[PDB]
Amino acid sequence: SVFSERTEESSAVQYFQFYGYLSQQQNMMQDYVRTGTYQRAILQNHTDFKDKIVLDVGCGSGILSFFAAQAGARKIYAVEASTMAQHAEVLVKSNNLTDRIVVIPGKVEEVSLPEQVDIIISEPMGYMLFNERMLESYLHAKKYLKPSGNMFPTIGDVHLAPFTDEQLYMEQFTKANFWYQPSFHGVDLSALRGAAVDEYFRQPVVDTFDIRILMAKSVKYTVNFLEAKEGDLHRIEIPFKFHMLHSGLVHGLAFWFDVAFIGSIMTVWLSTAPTEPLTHWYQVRCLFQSPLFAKAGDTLSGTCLLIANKRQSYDISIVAQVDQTGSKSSNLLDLKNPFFRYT
Amino acid sequence: RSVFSERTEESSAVQYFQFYGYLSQQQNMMQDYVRTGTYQRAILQNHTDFKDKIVLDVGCGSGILSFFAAQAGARKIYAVEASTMAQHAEVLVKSNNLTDRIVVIPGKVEEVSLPEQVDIIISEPMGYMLFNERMLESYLHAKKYLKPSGNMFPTIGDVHLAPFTDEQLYMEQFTKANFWYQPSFHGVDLSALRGAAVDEYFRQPVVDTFDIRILMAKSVKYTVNFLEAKEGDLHRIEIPFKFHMLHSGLVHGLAFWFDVAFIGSIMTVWLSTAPTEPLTHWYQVRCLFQSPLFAKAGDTLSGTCLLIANKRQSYDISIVAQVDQTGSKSSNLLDLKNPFFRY
């Protein structure tokens, strides 16, 4: 299948075991920004659901399907690959909805649906949006969408902005400098210091921050789920040309995302921006190996290249330079293995 | 087909050795000064067990124990490591000018080929609760390379279990499970899964430390003699127990910790993770009862702890405990591979 050909089996096993836990369903469900907004998006666009056929991709415990039912859907096919499908089935029975919600255990790339649907609903967003490569499964599901169909969420925006965080940067060398000692219990560790530094800089940092650390207005990269194809997400190139609002050392790029549910009645936005209430996606920062000095009014241009890998994530390559000086920096990061820094 | 791959799901092994490929994880263990200082003491204070001897280091990580064997005068040290940390060990061997004595051999000890039989095997095969990781079986497997007169460092392992009372820990877990008691979470009845949620949360052993005053009876001891045991001895570990309750109150579960002894020719050195001893990165482990047992001082709490090795490099834990005087019985099943790291 499309899923198996792009996913290492070992990545998939751990991935769906994580989603088999009720504790992890509960973790997302308790995010009121996340759950409340989906319910508001669906219920406030009730005419997109009343008497419609719905497909729920990666439904977990099925909560989005119950929102579609609250909105009046006539038939909801709820697809989920983890063992959580079994629990969703229990909930559909206990809520006396077996006539309207059908749980289809399996990968959306491999199950069969009995008919086409009017709308697809899903939560395919990982941290930095693209982690999990679930957007591809969501786009793959459009083979079941009727020509006029809609998608909830309809579009996704990723925002990039440069930041200054001297303490976060120096933290990497404090940690790596453990290895820079000539006699750890008699052993000279110093030869591994450089490798330790490289290891730390390869980790995206998942936490939140004060918006005053941002040094330029954000650049936006948009995925239109109604038009995009799976293959568009294998190589994601995000060029940027930041016009610096503040003078200082740029230590990396900060990432967040918004999705929009574009319904017949209204558009509802779910934002993970640092100007908004915190969500379980937090925000994501990728450090530069070396900071770049930029004066206010200088231009910081470069590219963020995301390359999908078979571990359901992305290799991140960021290249940036200050145009007025030529000062250049880069970094390579492994989105699958971030550092959780929030406390 | 190797002994390792026959007993291990490849999906589990990939994740397992990825974890141990990180220098940050080596630093984590190395910075445990009780751990590293006690290993060095056990080796250096028994230097005659190493002087001019051939050593096998099983799961050497970055090589620290091999360096300790070299400081004690070992003639040759074969350092076997299956993670990518083996390459970093090679770097440290060269930068420490010990290429003539420490030979890194990358791979699983069940699959590599050692050039000669050894006088002594050293290793850190202890996971949390001692048995997690099933490294003990790899340690015992390595005895195929051990001379008849050989020694093992560690030589024995003692698992301790004692009943504990901790209302706060019990309610903390039960409160999480109670999320799934809600009949109207955003209008959705979740209660049909409350039973499954309680089972899931209480399947997690709790890894943290605690005050010794929560223990309600003297511990029972189960000893594994590494010099004598065989791999197959650890597939099914049965630990009967009969506790003489020293205090009245509710028994919320069993608490676990372990000691290992390095039985050298000069002296025996102990490495303890007991709650009466300075804290280590192994902490201690508690398995909760879904419903605590009420016992009076002088009652006997009897049962068995059964550990069944699984293909995920860990154990399925079965605990059955009974207050003999009242026939109050509790049966629990815990997944050692997936604990709650509470500290």
Partner: peptide
Amino acid sequence: QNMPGAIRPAAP
């Protein structure tokens, strides 16, 4: 701090 295997971060 590291989150090996935790696909989604613990909620805040």
